[PDB]
Write a protein that binds this ligand. Sequence first.
Ligand SMILES: CCCCCCCCCCCCCC(=O)O
Length: 90
Amino acid sequence: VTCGQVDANLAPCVPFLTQGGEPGAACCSGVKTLNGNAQSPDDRKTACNCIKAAANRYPNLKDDAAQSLPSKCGISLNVPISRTINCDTI
Ligand SMILES: CCCCCCCCCCCCCC(=O)O
């Protein structure tokens, strides 16, 4: 819904998103929280663009790092996590 919740839930992933390894229970909990509260197509689009905004705030990260997040947390997302993602394909 709002990008503040996106950032708050993704905060515990910055250690994983900068240092790799296995994401802790906090980061996985945040990813699942974000996924659960983005239900309608407009919800998922808003969240996708909040994610792009955060990615531009952290523009020195690797996108292949964040793509391993859903598989390592359980979820199968509907978009590639890449800084170039066209969120309109949702
Ligand atoms: C690497 C491109 C995909 C984007 C990865 C998720 C967004 C970057 C992490 C920033 C999350 C916000 C954390 C914060 O601002 O406290």
